[PDB]
Structures are given as structure tokens and as C-alpha cells.
Amino acid sequence: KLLPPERMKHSIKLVDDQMNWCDSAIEYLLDQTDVLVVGVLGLQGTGKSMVMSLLSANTPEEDQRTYVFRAQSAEMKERGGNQTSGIDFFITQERIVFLDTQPILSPSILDHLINNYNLPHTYVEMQSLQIAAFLFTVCHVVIVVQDWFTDLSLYRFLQTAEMVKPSTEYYPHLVFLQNKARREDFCPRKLRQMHLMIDQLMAHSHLRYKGTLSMLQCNVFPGLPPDFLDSEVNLFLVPFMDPLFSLLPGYRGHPSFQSLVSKLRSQVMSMARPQLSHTILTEKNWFHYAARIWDGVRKSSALAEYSRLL
């Protein structure tokens, strides 16, 4: 008489591709408290869907055709199109909510909207800003996935999104995930430059991008002392897919993909869960709060002010 409610096999659609709410996740929610919400953000081919799938209910040794979050297929890469649309939803058995996100400012959505405001160009930017603000106001942590280092345009977008957010202020933690890392990026000399650039580029961001999720203490660098870094921000690197002398494998210079994925998952799960509103909330209450926030963000006033400026 204490069996679990149900087990989710595949992620559902929390928000339709037309920016419409979809109330269909209450069937898998309970009345428990102390819930954790994780969101993702990134460009078109960064790999947010794969990261979310591997961090929620998947393993690297499994296949990409059975992932909880649909990933880009080989036939789709040749056409230069996107796969994830709208916002997804999935909750693991540990009562951890995972939220996916479509690419921001991606040319695929723009091209699809061409054959369908003053011009059909600021619409994509506003949709991206709306999603960023929503994830920044109803999620406990947000992970930013970057295909390459220093895009120089994501920081400005993040600051602008946080400046136009809906609303003793609450600022969720920010995580910088560098996907498809190489050996050259796994050196202390380059690490210092990376941390310095990240810290100097977000000096007045008001977000919690430091003091938590320190990969230096996760045994990634055995002999690297903590004082070697002026300010270790929350940055993590994810590498590319992976008689006796002649059988020695090649030298990669970076830890195994599975090891880093497991470490990242453990660190994400062992994170804090601060309060969102000025009251305690449960799973159902959190769902209702998120729905109300999305409804308010859609018919907001700051967005119109920013729209007349473009």
C-alpha cells in the first residue's frame, strides 16, 4: 500500500512548439516537498539533449535511439536542422525534475519561420529571451552548454535575459559546460585563462557562478593545488565520444568520457535546493507556480519595451 505512483519511460512536452502551455505532467507528480529543478541552454549543435539524457536516466554505453530526450539524427545533420522543439519535461525516480530547451538563435528555426513584428528576425530573439527568463525564474539550476570556448555573444544574451526577467531577489546558479573538449583544453595553463576570462566577463552578473561545483576538488587534476587558480568558477568540461606493449591505446590527455559524465551527474544531484517564492512549495504547487509564471511572462510589459527598441 506504498508502491510508487508510476515510472516515466519517455519525456513529455511541457510547452508546445507554438509557445502554448501543456498541462499533462500532473499525472506523474506527488505532494512531496524539496524538489530540484534543472534546466539547460545552448546553441544548435552543442548537445543539450544528449547531456540531459545522460544525466537523467541514461548511460553512455546505451544507444542514442532509446534516449529519454530525442537527439539529432544523422539524416538531420546533413540538412542543418534542429531536433528539439519547445520545452520538454522528465522526472527521475529521485524526484528530480529535468527541463530541456530548444536552441536559441538557431538558423533552423529562422529558416522554418521564413516560409510562414516588422521582420521575422526579432521573433526568434524574443523567444530565446522568454525561455531564458522562464528558466531563470522557475528552475533551481541552469546549465549552459557551449560548443566552442568564448562565443563572446552568450554572455551579453544572458545578461540581457536576466535584465528583462519577470521578477530579496532570487538568482539561480549558473553552470558553464564546455562540450566536445580536446586535449589542449585540459591543461592548467589554459584552465587559468578560461577561469580568468569567465570571471572578468561576468563581474556584475548577480548570478551564483562561483563557490559551487568546483571540478578541481573532483579529482580531475591530481596534483593541481587550489591556490593555483585566482577564482575557480563553476566550469566543467565534457570530452568527445570515446606482447602487451603493442596493444597500448592512444594517448588522449583527458579523462574518460564515462568518468567525467558520472562525476558531473553526481555533482549536479548533490547540489543545493534553495526556496523559490516566499513560501514552501510541493511538486504540484511548483507546477502551478511555473504555469502562472509562464502565463505572466507571455503577456509581460518589459518584453514590449524591449520590442519597440528593435
Ligand X SMILES: Nc1ncnc2c1ncn2[C@@H]1O[C@H](COP(=O)(O)OP(=O)(O)OP(=O)(O)O)[C@@H](O)[C@H]1O
Q: Which residues bind Mg ion (CB under 5 A)?
A: 49, 83-84
Q: CA-based angle 246:250:253, to the nearest 5?
A: 145
Among 180, 263, 265, 288, interactor with ligand X by CB under 6 A: 180
Work out how close the CB of 205 gets to other proteins at its nearest, in angstroms, rounded to a whole number. 11
Among 11, 29, 36, 44, interactor with ligand X by CB under 6 A: 44
Work out how close the CB of 25 gets to Mg ion at its nearest, in angstroms, rounded to a whole number. 19
User: Nine-digit cell at 21?
Assistant: 502551455
- What φ, ψ does residue 281 adopt, rounded to 5°? -130, 150
Among 48, 165, 173, 195, interactor with ligand X by CB under 6 A: 48
Among 46, 56, 146, 234, interactor with ligand X by CB under 6 A: 46
Q: Which does 46 bind (CB under 5 to 8 A by kind): ligand X, other proteins, Mg ion, none?
A: ligand X
- Using CA of residue 51, residue 57, residue 62, residue 67, what is the dihedral sign? negative
Work out how close the CB of 279 gets to other proteins at its nearest, in angstroms, rounded to a whole number. 18
Q: Which positions touch other proteins (CB under 8 A)?
A: 163, 168-169, 204, 302, 305
Q: Which is nearer to Mg ion, 83 or 285 (CB)?
A: 83
Half-sphere exposure of 258 (CA within 13 A, CB side): 6
Work out how close the CB of 203 gets to other proteins at its nearest, in angstroms, rounded to a whole number. 12
Q: Which is nearer to ligand X, 58 or 84 (CB)?
A: 84
Work out how close the CB of 296 gets to other proteins at its nearest, in angstroms, rounded to a whole number. 16
Q: Which is nearer to ligand X, 64 or 127 (CB)?
A: 64
Work out how close the CB of 23 gets to Mg ion at its nearest, in angstroms, rounded to a whole number. 23
CA–CA separation, 120 and 215 (whole Å): 42
Asked if 241 touches ligand X (CB under 6 A), the answer is: yes
Q: Which is nearer to other proteins, 205 or 259 (CB)?
A: 205
Q: Which is nearer to other proteins, 187 or 302 (CB)?
A: 302
Asked if 83 touches ligand X (CB under 6 A), the answer is: yes
CA–CA separation, 15 and 36 (whole Å): 19
Q: Which is nearer to ligand X, 1 or 65 (CB)?
A: 65
- What φ, ψ does residue 81 adopt, rounded to 5°? -115, 165
Asked if 50 touches ligand X (CB under 6 A), the answer is: yes
Which residues in 87-116 contact ligand X (CB under 6 A)?
A: 103
CA–CA separation, 17 and 96 (whole Å): 24
Q: Which residues bind ligand X (CB under 6 A)?
A: 42, 44-50, 64, 71-72, 82-84, 103, 179-180, 238, 240-241
